[PDB]
UniProtKB/Swiss-Prot annotation:
Family: Belongs to the protein disulfide isomerase family.
Higher taxonomy: Eukaryota, Fungi, Dikarya, Ascomycota, Pezizomycotina
Whole sequence portion shown: 228 to 355 of 505
Subcellular location: Endoplasmic reticulum lumen
Organism, as annotated: Humicola insolens
Job of this protein: Participates in the folding of proteins containing disulfide bonds, may be involved in glycosylation, prolyl hydroxylation and triglyceride transfer.
Domain of life: Eukaryota
Name recorded for this polypeptide: Protein disulfide-isomerase
Amino acid sequence: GPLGSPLIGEIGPETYSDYMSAGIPLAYIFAETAEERKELSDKLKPIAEAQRGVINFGTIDAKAFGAHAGNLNLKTDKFPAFAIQEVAKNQKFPFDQEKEITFEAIKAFVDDFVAGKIEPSIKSEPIPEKQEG
């Protein structure tokens, strides 16, 4: 039976707008591995337990949804992947797909993100000419 309210877990069609309308950074966690999900999501357990009320931790499939992993930055070249969509600035501070997706690595990374250490990697593309400026 019920045991509270849904927040961190699996991202769906009714959760996207909820994490986007919530007004807090969205922590996407793509993963082509739907078997060992516990491993990634575990290290993530704390990565969000620290930011449970500041970031929306939601897991996603990097095999079927992967296209959504880099729709904010990544290239969907490898997985699992991790994205950090900001619903305040509309930023996307995801993780690498050739480094190592652990806890200390994500928890620390995101930590360096929220703190104000991480910044856009590919985003930011203005349209000069008669327009803008």
